[PDB]
Design a protein around this ligand. Structure first.
Ligand SMILES: O=C(O)c1ccc(-c2cc3cccnc3c(-c3cccc([N+](=O)[O-])c3)n2)cc1
Ligand SMILES: O=C(O)c1ccc(-c2cc3cccnc3c(-c3cccc([N+](=O)[O-])c3)n2)cc1
Ligand SMILES: [Mg+2]
Ligand SMILES: [Mg+2]
Ligand SMILES: [Zn+2]
Ligand SMILES: [Zn+2]
Lengths: 326, 325
């Protein structure tokens, strides 16, 4: 019961950026996604609002967590838990207070939880290039993301797993559509278009008399949620360095494993997947300069000045990785 | 019977082919015989080094995956769309617009475009929480499935008709076929028509009057609208054929409508047998969907789609005449 109290102590930081998710993973017996999701649902009073039976929630979460691969270095249950918790913090930003309904909040969090379920540890391009069964099923379009959604929803049909059993038909219909729109937007090939639209929104931003963001149509509302989860998905470089470095170690291991498979297939090794010609530090600086910072700088503007500290950490981490190059 | 069949196939390059007769004369193998005839007519087996036996094996396997108990979306409809696309590709206004690979893609796409169709709509599959809708996240559910089945069948014994295409050709073919079949999703009609109109008001032609499509984006857009037009070509065919197609789609619709009623669902339009107006519906279908599309296409290849647009207007007049004052 002592380890349980230690876990509870750690979960007290659920509303903070930089929570130590790896520690929670260890303290929870490798159930970070289940405990963090359960904690967040209680924190947001979602069980009461949507009449979700506690046993049903725990059963679904354990089943969902089970469908993430424990043998994939990065795209596993810890990453899912991290994206869920990061999205949870972003949803609480002052600039968005009272903006989203409980159903939209539920959608964003659920989407985050299932967004990478059953990820094999290889990219969409690798699956397409190897004529995989998955790419055949999904016609080379958002292959993995379509699969994550299919699995996430299908698991709700398992014994005592339908956590949405008490939502109205209309609520279920709306939630399913929002979750699909959000997870499909996590396809990295859509990053540029997603960012392009986010920039357009910031340039034409409008706030209410309360000072919060004004979103009066589905298009704008779902666009903000899509970008929110995408930011959470790309939040590793914005976290305290000891967390960021572990995430980098994990994605590189995953990349190298894919590279070994590509080499063993006589295929041209994907970028940053060749362990015999890798520049980890220079690659992280590039990742931040061309993808992560442009995105976070834009999000920071949308919710200014709410994300200033997050942006400052990202810039400090960029500076640090750069310093390891000279 | 083979002499009669071979005789009917002589009009494979004509709009209004007796596809139903061909189905009956071929032992219900319209898709196989029509596809085979077209590949030869266009000399595609030689161009892409496709083994004759491999072509036959695949075609039969493919045709076997169309449901014989589905009134409209079966192998006869597939055969009809293939043949219709085959004719549209010969439009003089498009004589030197598409490459052989693009021609191959449009034809193959037409053949597999409705494979394994269950006889119910995407909306029905979505509202009933079907396995198919769950798999495809309510997006172009059937069309994604037709493609998946179409390509998967190539993996069956002696069924890879693209075995001799280069790596780049296969990759390009797959992309175009996917782009074309996904465009047959009826919910994308308005968007596809819009793009078609834009290409018309910004069209460029040559001396012979042939269309000039430089960008792949515009080319695939034409092929998408082409196969879409073929998919919606029933009302532009001789009346005897059109009426048979109408009987079939209505039978399929009514069978679905009953299911929507047996389950307390909002019966989809024109799916209520106890409350339907076949004739008024066809006129509406022509006025709001088919004519707008074919009129726009007619302008694109102006004026080579005049005989087709004429038959459509004649059929529209006949159906209207069957409606009492
Ligand atoms: O295909 C996908 O869905 C996918 C691919 C890559 C990443 C990813 C995650 C990272 C996390 C932490 C540090 N780096 C990560 C990188 C990454 C690493 C090195 C270089 C680059 N880059 O973009 O140049 C990116 N990529 C996520 C998702
Ligand atoms: O969901 C789909 O993929 C789908 C749905 C309907 C049709 C279709 C085919 C017709 C063929 C011949 C005459 N009519 C057809 C109609 C149709 C019939 C009556 C009215 C209408 N309409 O749109 O009003 C359409 N619909 C095809 C495909
Ligand atoms: Mg992902
Ligand atoms: Mg179809
Ligand atoms: Zn992810
Ligand atoms: Zn069709």
């Amino acid at each position: 019961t002592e380890q349980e109290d230690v876990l509870a102590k750690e979960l007290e930081d659920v509303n903070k950026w930089g929570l130590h998710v790896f520690r929670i993973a260890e303290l929870s017996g490798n159930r970070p996604l289940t405990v963090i999701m359960h904690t967040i649902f209680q924190e947001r009073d979602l069980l009461k609002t949507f009449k979700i039976p506690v046993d049903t929630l725990i059963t679904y979460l354990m089943t969902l967590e089970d469908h993430y691969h424990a043998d994939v270095a990065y795209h596993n249950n810890i990453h899912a838990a991290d994206v869920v918790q990061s999205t949870h913090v972003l949803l609480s930003t002052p600039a968005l207070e009272a903006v989203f309904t409980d159903l939209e909040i539920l959608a964003a969090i659920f989407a985050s939880a299932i967004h990478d379920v059953d990820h094999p540890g290889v990219s969409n391009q690798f699956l397409i290039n190897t004529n995989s069964e998955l790419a055949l099923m999904y016609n080379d379009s958002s292959v993995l993301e379509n699969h994550h959604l299919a699995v996430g929803f299908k698991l709700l049909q398992e014994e005592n797993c339908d956590i949405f059993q008490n939502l109205t038909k209309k609520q279920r219909q709306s939630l399913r559509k929002m979750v699909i729109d959000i997870v499909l937007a996590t396809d990295m090939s859509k990053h540029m278009n997603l960012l392009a639209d986010l920039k357009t929104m910031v340039e034409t931003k409008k706030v209410t008399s309360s000072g919060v963001l004004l979103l009066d149509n589905y298009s704008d509302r779902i666009q903000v949620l899509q970008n929110m989860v995408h930011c959470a998905d790309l939040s590793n470089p914005t976290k305290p360095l000891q967390l960021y470095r572990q995430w980098t170690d994990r994605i590189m291991e995953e990349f190298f494993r894919q590279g070994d498979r590509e080499r063993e297939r006589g295929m041209e090794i994907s970028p940053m997947c060749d362990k015999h010609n890798a520049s980890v530090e220079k690659s992280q600086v590039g990742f931040i300069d061309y993808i992560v910072h442009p995105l976070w700088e834009t999000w920071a503007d949308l919710v200014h000045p709410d994300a200033q500290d997050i942006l400052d950490t990202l810039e400090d981490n960029r500076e640090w990785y750069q310093s390891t190059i000279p």
